[PDB]
Each structure stands twice: as structure tokens, then as C-alpha cells.
Amino acid sequence: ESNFGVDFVIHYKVPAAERDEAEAGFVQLIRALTTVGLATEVRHGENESLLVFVKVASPDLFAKQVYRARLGDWLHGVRVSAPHNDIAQALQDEPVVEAERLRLIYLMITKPHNEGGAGVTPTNAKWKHVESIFPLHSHSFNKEWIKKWSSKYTLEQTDIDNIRDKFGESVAFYFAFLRSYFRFLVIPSAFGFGAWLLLGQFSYLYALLCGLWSVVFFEYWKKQEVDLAVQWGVRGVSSIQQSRPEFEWEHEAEDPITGEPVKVYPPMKRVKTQLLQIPFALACVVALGALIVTCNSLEVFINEVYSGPGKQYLGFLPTIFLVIGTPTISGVLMGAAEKLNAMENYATVDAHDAALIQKQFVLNFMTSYMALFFTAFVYIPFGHILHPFLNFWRATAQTLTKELPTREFQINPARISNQMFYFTVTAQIVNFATEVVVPYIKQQAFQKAKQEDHEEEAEFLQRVREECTLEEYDVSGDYREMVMQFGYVAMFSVAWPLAACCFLVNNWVELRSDALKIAISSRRPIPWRTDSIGPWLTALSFLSWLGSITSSAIVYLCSNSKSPLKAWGLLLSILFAEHFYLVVQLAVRFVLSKLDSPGLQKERKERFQTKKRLLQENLGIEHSEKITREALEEEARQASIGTPEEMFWQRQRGMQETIEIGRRMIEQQLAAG
Amino acid sequence: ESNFGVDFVIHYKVPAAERDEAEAGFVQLIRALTTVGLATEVRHGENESLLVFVKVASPDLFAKQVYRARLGDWLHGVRVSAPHNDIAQALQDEPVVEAERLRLIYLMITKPHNEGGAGVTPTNAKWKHVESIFPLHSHSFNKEWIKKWSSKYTLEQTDIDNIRDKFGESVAFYFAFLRSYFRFLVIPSAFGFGAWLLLGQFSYLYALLCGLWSVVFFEYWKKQEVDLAVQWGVRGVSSIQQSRPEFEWEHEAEDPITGEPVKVYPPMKRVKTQLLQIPFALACVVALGALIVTCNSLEVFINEVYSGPGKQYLGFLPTIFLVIGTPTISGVLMGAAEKLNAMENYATVDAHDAALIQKQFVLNFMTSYMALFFTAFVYIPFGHILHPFLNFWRATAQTLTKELPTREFQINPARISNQMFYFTVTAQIVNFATEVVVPYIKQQAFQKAKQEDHEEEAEFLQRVREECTLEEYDVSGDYREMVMQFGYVAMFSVAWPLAACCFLVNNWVELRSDALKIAISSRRPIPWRTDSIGPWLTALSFLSWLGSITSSAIVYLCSNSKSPLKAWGLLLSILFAEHFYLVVQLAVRFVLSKLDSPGLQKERKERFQTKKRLLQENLGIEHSEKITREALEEEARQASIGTPEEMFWQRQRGMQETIEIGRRMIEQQLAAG
Ligand SMILES: [Ca+2]
Ligand SMILES: [Ca+2]
Ligand SMILES: [Ca+2]
Ligand SMILES: [Ca+2]
């Protein structure tokens, strides 16, 4: 039914040929683990492997290792609350959760062996045969988790705080971002259903309301992110996570924050190499932008200028030419993104994978909006610039198949509504069939491909050999869906104002669809820590900025197709609705700064009560005669040896002499006049 | 020669008629001071007043009052360094400076009498007769300060750190802003003398270089401001300064940061009233903007369309009509700014005077740039819109003085060079005669208007009666010059690129001119504390933003007067050179974040060494048998009562059994195939 107390499982693939270092490396693995302090087992693998099963042996030593890592966080400003002074009592105050238990075990297994437990890092390449280090699922918990989340309409902060406890924080920021995005998507579904009903399409009032929402939501998430990063105690872990073994370093100095010597790469040698992605991000706009346009210039040739045979047969020819082409060019540019990401020499492993996202955001910008930036800006306002393109495909179809019958070219203004219907209805359904249904069918193809084991543990070992074949849950992958989906709302939703009503329905499925993908279709992720969503905050801030320029260039260029377009009107329509974005950015950033922040106030209270605790530890008529005694003493100590200095103060000592000379000098100053 | 140890001097004006409450209030003053712990004297005033002379009586009580206010700052996160544990030894570690001595005396004199010393606040209105509370100058220090600062070309950080020690921090941020602005003004004086020599006037390359500098300088000052606010220990005093007696409050709760009960005004009731200055800032643009234009539309009538008598006599008629008018309309709008500033109900006294600046920035924007916004944008590009204006002053001059001889109207493109020559050369000289020379002459008019005193202190009392007549140094006043002077560099310097070469010469005088104004022409200011320059950071950030729009609309509208102007070219010239400002804002904000910050690292080191001090106080082969002993114990404690759980771990205990079954299960898995 349940796991047998098993913390982690290491796979350790052994090949038939070249088993000479796999057998001796198994000795080098199974005895390196026991020096850390964790017991082991070995069972039969799937075909040709050795699942070893580790658990921490003595909890009286592990309870001292949680406390040694709780103080290690609290010294670094991560935890706002200090642990309790009595050892083995702070665990009774706050328990150890299943995320903090598996994280410190994984830091014991993966470490450079000089500062922690051991190294079973697969990138060390001496442990080449170590295939996967993964924790087991809790199938009595996943059965309740899908049941509890499907029997409720809205979620609750307590229902995310038990995803923090078991799947770490890096997973539980996604479900806390998706909940705080499905609830903010009611607001463009409020007036978006309004401006589809009352106003016409391409309404300027909706293009301002959806510029206000995209900065109300984004600046409220940054205020909700430092409330979760305090309450979960994950406040600023960007400088704490373990460095990389491939981190080359120029020289080694001392850390001015801490004192311990660290490896130092000079940052102005890194900004010179980080600058080199400006010709990269221009090259990805050029390369992938030339494929989507050439595919769409052919797709407008088959549909709009054609009369020959097979209009529906040849209509699927561009879409085949895209989905074969677009992973080939993306695979080449990722070969240039990866060979540039190692050249930038990132220190922490969390800031190396968070720069592979910003170098893959440009590849996943052009593949999702150049199909719409070509329709809304080139095709629908002034599409007669395509006559070089539509004469090329005539001359491409003359030499292949007599004159081919081609009709006259006419701009169809419904192409912006057909393409937004695909990206908001069809490409959300077929994404749901790809996310959930297709891997759920793929286990039946593993069922077709189905061993001297023991009969007591036979049901449990049948599950672990099944669980090894699944892929690790890439939580950066599901952020990429909910940020591109933010793009169609911020940028292109003015062209189809129901596009927030068919994402609110999809996100409420996606809040449970992605919860299904953790349970049945992926192994349990290693519980990492993040303080933010990462490099998506610079991707939500870019689409929300662009979503005030292209959501107002659409409402000018495309509304006149339902007068000539003049260039002074467009550049004024950009200038007002981008400055309105920058003004309402400054209004929301000023209003939310005036609100009560229960994250920093929980932090700045414990910082104050630390010093007030430190203060009370070390520090545990009658005043007028103190005035007189020191005044006569100053004359007494200068009576031995002055004349213009201390004889100035001794004339009016005390106060009763002072009011006497004070009152006598009032009539003496007023009887003269 | 020097003051006789006198800390402060209270003036206490007493009138002839209504002396009934001045005599009894003098008793209520001179005995309220002695309950605090400071000695007093009374001497003859100037004509009809009573200068009382206070000093702290016993330094053994004052040394405990500095320490009670050093811990009061360190508990609030102001001071990054805790004081020494031994009492009367932290004064030997760091001494008490003359700014921190006079500040705690002024907090003893001015306080609500329930939490501190006493109340001699003149706004209490029971101490109505108390005129001025001021500390005396050190005329042996001012003689060296002008000598040391005039005998050097460049200044030094040590030469500002002894202005922190004696004139407080609120003065010494001005001299540290003026030094960090005169040194950054070399850079537009570098290529500004270049682009005046090499390129022509209205050069677009200078309009980008002066948009880059205005964000390099502004984002380097914000990095230099948290380096001074740590080193001087003034880190974040915005929530520490004393509240106002006129602060009305709705209810009283507890402070979540501290715990002590405070008076609470709900901030969303304040943002509703702070929003009301948007019709105010529109009204100041309308009111003062209609005076400067009507004055300039008359000034272009006398100079450009006129042939009658007295062209130089009538030419000074608009400038007389401005300098009489513009303080009358400004005095009315400040009557509306002050009656709105009390309606916003600010808590601290430092945030009440820092919102009177932002409500006087609009009055001091239009009075300094509407003379140039009318020339550069209305007169010089397309000035034939002034023909309604230039026909009005014809009909105004027909009915006053036969037909008047008027010549033909022609646009003179040298008006942008004549007006920038006034604002950069003439209005800096005549500002220097107004700042220094005119008050230095005004003491000779006090010498013409020149008493039963004592002959020993007669030279000292002759100086204090002279020093009472001076005005308090308003350090907000000299910021207003160096921010308007930043405006002509950021906005209008592209029209006259030598305008940075005649401000670099002026600032090097102003760095010593304003140092002369503290010594001889103003009394010593009370040493307050600020963490920033205040509301000028939102005024430098606005002029540097506007200085990428109007410094690029000038270079398009005015360069063609040396082709027709098209509106699509202007809105594109704004859109590129404002987005270039927002891009180079993001480059400088990212580069300077990667640099080493010695302010926060001095703060985040002492915060770490506090907890490491707190940690060491309370906390002051062989491992494989610990694995074995707990594994046999877990079977031992379950031997009494399981079968699928603990009998899973006991099969391979230790590690030598594990490699034995591990190696035997390698050939058993590979001899089958
Ligand atoms: Ca989906
Ligand atoms: Ca997803
Ligand atoms: Ca001046
Ligand atoms: Ca000045």
C-alpha cells in the first residue's frame, strides 16, 4: 500500500558489456552512502539495473542534522524565526515536513564530499552509471489530493500549504501562482464578456482596461510573493543554493557577508558575455520569424488565392511544413543557447537553469506570436504588401503543376478571429490531450512490453520499477504555458474579447490537470527551494509592457477594416496607451506600497524582537540639585587655576536666582521706553 | 572668541503691551527647562527680548542620554553597529559629535512632555512668546572652513564628513549631493564642448548622450545615497522622527513592528485626498502657464513687431509685468497648496514638509521652463500660430497710443540661444549676487540701525544679538536651485551644448558659495537627520524622464529651421528617444546592481555577526556501527508485536552483506541473457 519508509531510490544502470567499472563503482557507491549515515538495501531492477533503497538510519542523528541546517539558514537571513534554544524541542514546536526531510537527504547524497556527506552527482562522471536519484510517491496521498481538489470550486491557502510540505516550494509556487492567476482572470472575463456584448470588436476602452489589469495583476503577484516567501521561510535563497562543479573561477577571496572563502568570478567579465545574447535574441527573431511568415505566406496562398484541386488537401501542407521545421530550427538555436550559457559561467545551479529560460523565451516568443503578429499587423491592416509573396507562390506553383487558376486577392478580416479561436479554444483542448491523455495512453504501450523476486515486497517493487521509467517533473515547463497564455490576454485579447472567458475555464482545469500530472504521469520532484517564480517575472513584465503597445496598435490598424490609416495616428495611439501604462504602473506601485504587507512585517517584527531579547539579557526637585552640584563643582575645579568662561555660568545658578534677574531685567528693559 | 559652552539659545520675545502672560510664561519656560536636566542663564536681548542660554548641566547624565538614544536607534534598525556593552565606553569607541549633541538637546527642549523632556514648541501656542530656538555658530571653525574649501580644487569625502559632525546630516547631504553633481557635470561638459565644436547645434547624437548621462548620474546617486546613509548611520529614519501635534487620528492600535501604541490614520483615506493634487497640478500649469506665455507673447510683440518710439524702453515692460505678477499668483496657489497640505494629515513632520515641496515643484516648474517651452515648441518651429496673439497687441496698442508702425513678423531662430544664455550665464551671476552679496550688504543696513550689559561678556553678547536677526537656513531652498539647474541640462541643453560648461564653473562656486551662506549669512541649522535628499529624487527622476522627450522634440522641431515638419516624424523621434531612455535605464540599473555595494555589505555583515555572536553564546568506521545498532533496535522493538515493513530493512544490514547480495544479483541478472 505504502512505501516502506523509503526516502530515496537510486537507479544505478549497469550495462552488459563494460561491467568492469559498474561492479567496482557499485562498491564505490554503496560504501560512500554508509559513511554519511544512511542505511541501504538492494533489489532487482527493471531489466539490467540495481535499485538501491536508502533511508536515514538513526533519527537521533537526523534530528541534529535538521537543526544544523535550520541554523545554517537562519544565519543567512533565510528563516525569519530562530529555532528554539532547547535542542530536540524546535522539532516539537514546528515539525519536520516531508519536503524538508527529503531535501536534507538529497544534500547528503549530492555534495562535493569535502563539506557534506558524499557525491552521487551524475555530472561528476565517475558516477556515470548512477542513472536517477528520485523519491517515491505517496499513493495514499495522491488519491486524496485529486479527490479533494476536484470536489471544490475554489481552492484555499491551506490547500497549497500542504503541497509546500510534500512537493517542496518550487512546485508549490506554481500552484500558488496558478491560483493567484485563475482568480485574477475573472476580471478580464468580467468586462471581456461585457465588451464582447456591449461594445464591438477592437474597442479602445477594452485596450485600456486590459492594460490596467496586466499591471494590477503583476504588481499584486510581487506583493503576494514576498508574503509566501516569508510564511514558508524561503526568504531569499538565491545566494544559498549549492554551486556548480563546472564553475570556473579566477581567484578566491573571502566573503564580506559571511567570512568563509568562496570562488569569485568578476561580474564585469560576465556582463561582457551576457551582452552577447543581444545578437542571439536578434538571430532568433530573424530565424524563427522567417519560418512562421513563410509558412503563413504559403497558408494565405492556398486559402485565399487558389481555385485548383484539393483546397482542403493542400491546406494542411503549411501546417505540416511548420511542425517539422519549427523543432529543427529551435533545436539548432538551443545548441547555440546552451553553448553560450556555459560561456557565461554561472555560479549557482539555480541561476544557470534560470538563464536557459530567458534564452528560450525568445524561441518560445516567436513560435507563439509571429503567427499573430503577421496577421494583425501585416495581413489585416495593409495586406497588399504580400503581392511579392503571393506572386512568388504563383511562380512556385507554375513550375510544379498550363496556367493554374488563381482568384483575386481580397483581405479577409475574419482571419484575426479564426486564429484567436485556435489559440484560445483548440490549442487549449489539444494541449490538454497532450499534457494528460497522451502520457496516460503511453503506459498501456508499456503494458504491452511486460522475475525471481520475493513475494512479500512484490507489489511494492512492481511499482518502483514502473516509477523509474517516468520523466522528472520539469516545473519550468508548466510555467511556460501560463506565461504564453498570459501573452494572449495582455497582447492580443483586444481582437477577441472572449479570450479571457475561455482561459478562466481552462485554468480551472489546469489547476487540477497539472495536479494530475504530478500524481500519475511523473515521478516525485526533488523538493527544491525558490524565493520567486524566477525568470518569469521578467517575462510577465515584458508581455505586460508589450501588451500596451501591440494591444493599442491592433485597435487602430484593424478597427478601420470594419478611412485610411495614417502613421501619425498610430504613433499617437501607441504614445498615449503606452504612457497610460507607465502612469497606471506608477499608481499601482504606489497604492500597493501603502497597503499593509504581512510578509515584511512578520520579518521586521522578529528582527526587532531579536534585538529587544538581546537588550534585556545584558541590561537586566531632586533633579535641580544635580544642576546645582555640577555647576558649583565646575567652579570648584577651576578655582585652583576660567575667567570669561566659567564665571559666565556661575552668576545665575539654580533657577530661583534666574527668575529674579529675569524679572528685574524686564522692567529695566521697558522703563527706558 | 568662542561660545561659552552654550548649547542653545532661546529668544523669548516679550512685548510692551500684553506682558501679563509673557512674565508668567517666562516662569513657565525657565522652570520647565530645569526639570529636564539643563542649566540656564538670562541676558539682555536686542531691544525688547530675553535671550536665555541653556547648556546640559552634568555630562554624567548626558552620557547616559546619548546611550539611551543610541539603543533607541539601534532597536529601530537605524544604526547598523550596536553600541559597546560597557556603559561609558562606547563614547570612547566612537565620540559624540557636535551634531548628535545638539540634536538630543533639541529633543529635550522640544517634546510633548509625556515621553521626553519638555515642550518649548512654538506651535503649541501656549509658548507663543518663544520666538527662536537656535544653536550658536563656531566662528573659529567657519574661518577655517572657508579657508580650507577655497584653497582646494576638488573636495574629499573627509571634508564632508566633518560637515556631518557639526551641521547635521540634512545639511551634509546637500554638500554631498553637490559634490557628486559637480563631478558628474564634467561628462556633459566633455562632449558638450565637443558637440558645440565638432557638430552643429541641435545635434541628435548629443540628445542621446545627454539622455544617457541623466540616468547614469541619477542611478549612481541612489547607489551613493545608501552608502552615505549607512556610513553615517542614518539608515531609514523616515519612520523614527517625531510626529506632529496637529496630526489628527481616527483610532489607536498597536504597532506590529514595535508593540507600542501609535496614532493611526488609515492610508486609503489619505490616498483619496492625495489624489486631489491632480486638479491642483493641472491648475498650476494653467494659471502660471497663462502668465508666462502672455508675458512672452507681449515680449515678442515689442521686439519683433514694432517700429515706434522707445523699443528699448518698452522692452523692459514685460519683464516688469512678470516679476510683479509671478509672486502674486504663486502666493495664491501656495495658499491653496498649504490649505491642501493640512488636509492630507501627514504623520511625521519630515513628511509634511516633503509634500510641500512636491506641491511647490509645479509652481517652480512653470516659472522656470514655460519661458523655454514656449520658445522651443511654439515660437521657433511654427510661430505663425501667434498671429492671433500678435494681432491682439496691435489692437491693444491702437487704443492706447493714428496707425502705429508695425513691421512684418519673421521667426528669429536665435531666440533659443538668447534665452539659454540668460538661464545659464546671466541668471547664474545674478543668482550669485542675490544669494551672497545682497544679504552681505543687508547687514550694513543693520549697521545703520545701531546697553547696561556686563563688560566681560560684551563681545559675546554683541554677537548673539546679531545672530538672532538672521533667518534659519532652509536647506530645501538650495536643493531647488540644483534641481532646476539639472533641468536645463537634461531638457534644454541640446539647444545650446555649452550649457554644461557654464554650470560646472557655477557649481564649483556654488559648492563654496553655499558654504559661505552657512557661515556669515544664516544662523546654524538644527541638526536634523534624513536618509535621502527626500522629494527631490522624484523631481530628478521626472526631469530626467522629460529630458528624453523634450530634448528630442527640440532636435526635430528646431533643426529644420537651420523641409517641412511632419507629425509622424516627431512622434517617431519621441518614440525612439524615449524608449532609448527606458532601455538605458534598464542597462544602468542592471550594471550598478552587479557592482559591489559597500553600504549594504557593511549592513549585512553586522546583521550576520549579530546572529553569529548570538549563536556562540548559547551553543558554547565508527559511523557504520551506528547504522547497525539502530537497524537491529527497530527489529528489536517490533519483535514484541512489522512483517512487510521492518522485515524489508533487516535483510541487508550493514554494508558487507549488501555488496554480497549486490554482486550476486549482477550475474543473476546477466546470465539470463
Ligand atoms: Ca493545458
Ligand atoms: Ca501546465
Ligand atoms: Ca547661485
Ligand atoms: Ca544654492
Author numbering:
A (entry chain B), B (entry chain A): 15 to 415, 419 to 467, 476 to 587, 595 to 652, 664 to 684, 688 to 719
Verbatim from the authors:
First structural insight into lipid scrambling was provided from the X-ray structure of the fungal protein from Nectria haematococca, termed nhTMEM16. This protein is part of the TMEM16 family, which encompasses calcium-activated ion channels and lipid scramblases with a conserved molecular architecture. As common for the family, nhTMEM16 is a homodimer with subunits containing a cytoplasmic domain and a transmembrane unit composed of 10 membrane-spanning segments. The lipid permeation path is defined by a structural entity termed the ‘subunit cavity’, which is located at the periphery of each subunit. The ‘subunit cavity’ is believed to provide a pathway for the polar moieties of lipids across the membrane, whereas the apolar acyl chains remain embedded in the hydrophobic core of the bilayer.
